[PDB]
Write an enzyme that holds these catalytic residues in place. Structure first.
Site, mmCIF file in Angstrom:
data_model
loop_
_atom_site.group_PDB
_atom_site.id
_atom_site.type_symbol
_atom_site.label_atom_id
_atom_site.label_comp_id
_atom_site.label_asym_id
_atom_site.label_seq_id
_atom_site.Cartn_x
_atom_site.Cartn_y
_atom_site.Cartn_z
ATOM 1 N N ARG A 49 -30.373 27.863 -23.844
ATOM 2 C CA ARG A 49 -30.010 27.767 -25.216
ATOM 3 C C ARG A 49 -29.451 28.977 -26.075
ATOM 4 O O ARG A 49 -28.425 28.382 -26.763
ATOM 5 C CB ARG A 49 -31.564 26.990 -26.520
ATOM 6 C CG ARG A 49 -31.261 27.728 -27.832
ATOM 7 C CD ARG A 49 -33.250 27.816 -28.181
ATOM 8 N NE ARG A 49 -33.067 28.250 -29.362
ATOM 9 C CZ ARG A 49 -34.251 29.318 -30.031
ATOM 10 N NH1 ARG A 49 -34.583 30.101 -29.517
ATOM 11 N NH2 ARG A 49 -33.976 29.165 -32.028
ATOM 12 N N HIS A 53 -26.119 28.863 -28.115
ATOM 13 C CA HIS A 53 -26.464 29.669 -29.516
ATOM 14 C C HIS A 53 -25.388 31.066 -29.795
ATOM 15 O O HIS A 53 -25.013 30.964 -30.835
ATOM 16 C CB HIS A 53 -27.681 30.344 -29.811
ATOM 17 C CG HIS A 53 -28.058 28.790 -30.960
ATOM 18 N ND1 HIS A 53 -29.762 29.536 -31.659
ATOM 19 C CD2 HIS A 53 -28.391 27.799 -30.943
ATOM 20 C CE1 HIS A 53 -30.173 28.074 -32.062
ATOM 21 N NE2 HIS A 53 -29.260 27.398 -31.804
ATOM 22 N N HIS A 176 -31.779 18.518 -24.897
ATOM 23 C CA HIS A 176 -33.414 18.478 -25.242
ATOM 24 C C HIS A 176 -34.693 18.711 -24.038
ATOM 25 O O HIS A 176 -35.581 18.106 -24.072
ATOM 26 C CB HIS A 176 -33.543 18.315 -26.634
ATOM 27 C CG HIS A 176 -33.202 19.246 -27.739
ATOM 28 N ND1 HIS A 176 -32.647 18.563 -28.761
ATOM 29 C CD2 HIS A 176 -32.513 20.340 -27.878
ATOM 30 C CE1 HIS A 176 -32.027 19.569 -29.725
ATOM 31 N NE2 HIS A 176 -32.103 21.002 -29.047
ATOM 32 N N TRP A 192 -40.016 17.620 -26.081
ATOM 33 C CA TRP A 192 -39.074 16.536 -25.806
ATOM 34 C C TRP A 192 -39.470 15.398 -25.484
ATOM 35 O O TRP A 192 -39.452 14.614 -25.054
ATOM 36 C CB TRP A 192 -37.421 16.550 -25.986
ATOM 37 C CG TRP A 192 -36.702 17.282 -27.391
ATOM 38 C CD1 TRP A 192 -37.029 16.683 -28.299
ATOM 39 C CD2 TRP A 192 -36.623 18.797 -27.705
ATOM 40 N NE1 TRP A 192 -36.207 17.537 -29.741
ATOM 41 C CE2 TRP A 192 -36.069 19.097 -28.648
ATOM 42 C CE3 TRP A 192 -37.114 19.172 -26.946
ATOM 43 C CZ2 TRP A 192 -36.109 20.141 -28.894
ATOM 44 C CZ3 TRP A 192 -36.387 20.705 -27.634
ATOM 45 C CH2 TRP A 192 -36.053 21.094 -29.296
#
Ligand code: HEM
Ligand SMILES: [Co+2]
Ligand SMILES: [Mn+2]
Ligand code: NA
EC number: 1.11.1.5
Length: 295
Positions: A49, A53, A176, A192
């Site tokens: 992540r 990002h 995810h 998820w």
């Protein structure tokens, strides 16, 4: 209308494949050692992540943001509400950066994501060095990362700013499979899937095969929940409401190898957006896993 911001990749002085494999190995070894984080999920997902990002601020229009500058180290980006929770990834990388102070911040953040995906049994992600730290005034403003409380049209439009098409979007969102939402970070809660430190096509399988109920969580946000204890964001659920996205979700649910190939390309592209690699730059590196090295 056009702009002239060019970011040329410049190899860290005298460094080659073997140097970056050592950085990879240090990250991978720490992933193995610090494996209690987040109820034994480990740091793999947050590093993925973080890589996303730090790259996903890019704007194709003016070449602002992106992975090159490593600007997440500055407080404006560090404190972006969209980045809540990434501080844990940054802290993980601090002793890595201390051991290899020559690596640029951009190279480290992006390599962290590559390492995490590979060490969690994902596809090989070719990776190029040469990102160069840029100053604090080059930090992009908050609000360039995507909202979760939105539909397929929002997702499609959002990702056009990163020069990603439907297939690239659906492939990227397969990440995810890793990790989870944390109520205190994002206003969403739950994973998820089940095997959330192993990189698989499980996101697509769960999206298609689970019985989803639209519920409100404890932060008063809507999310889709299954009896198995999984969740989907409204943006994720939109991938089976939109017919063009649905076709691709089905493709990846039925063919993990195809997902792996498309994800590898899209993730490298994401991590390289905005960077000009000169003609005589080294070829992309493909790092060996610890398991491959017997380490
Ligand atoms: C529309 C696009 C996207 C939205 C709205 C979105 C939203 C979110 C949200 C809300 C979280 C939970 C953060 C938390 O509570 O800690 C999350 C986690 C995550 N997302 Fe995304 N995401 C998107 C795309 C992507 C992409 C493109 C990637 C990677 C290629 C990715 C990888 C991750 C990972 C690895 C986590 C787990 C973090 C952890 O467990 O610490 N996401 N995402
Ligand atoms: Co303009
Ligand atoms: Mn001009
Ligand atoms: Na352990």
């Amino acid at each position: 209308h056009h702009h002239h911001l060019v970011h040329v990749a410049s190899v860290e002085k005298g460094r080659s494949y073997e140097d970056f494999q050592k950085v990879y190995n240090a990250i991978a070894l720490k992933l193995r050692e610090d494996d209690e984080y987040d109820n034994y999920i480990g740091y793999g997902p947050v590093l993925v992540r973080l890589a996303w990002h730090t790259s996903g601020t890019w704007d194709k229009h003016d070449n602002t943001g992106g992975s090159y500058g490593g600007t997440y180290r500055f407080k404006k980006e560090f404190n972006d509400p969209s980045n809540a929770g990434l501080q844990n990834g940054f802290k993980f990388l601090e002793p890595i950066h201390k051991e290899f102070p020559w690596i640029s911040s951009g190279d480290l953040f992006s390599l962290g994501g590559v390492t995490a995906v590979q060490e969690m049994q994902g596809p090989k992600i070719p990776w190029r060095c040469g990102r160069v730290d840029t100053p604090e005034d080059t930090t992009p403003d908050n609000g360039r990362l995507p909202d979760a409380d939105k539909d397929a049209d929002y997702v499609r439009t959002f990702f056009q700013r990163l020069n990603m098409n439907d297939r690239e979007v659906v492939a990227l969102m397969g990440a995810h499979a890793l990790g989870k939402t944390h109520l205190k970070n994002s206003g969403y809660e739950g994973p998820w899937g089940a095997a959330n430190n192993v990189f698989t096509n499980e996101f697509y399988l769960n999206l298609l095969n689970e019985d989803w109920k639209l519920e409100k969580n404890d932060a008063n946000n809507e999310q889709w929940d299954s009896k198995s204890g999984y969740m989907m964001l409204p943006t994720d659920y939109s991938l089976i409401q939109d017919p063009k996205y649905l076709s691709i979700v089905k493709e990846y649910a039925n063919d993990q190898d195809k997902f792996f190939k498309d994800f590898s390309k899209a993730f490298e592209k994401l991590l390289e957006n905005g960077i000009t690699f000169p003609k005589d730059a080294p070829s992309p590196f493909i790092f060996k896993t610890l398991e491959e090295q017997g380490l």
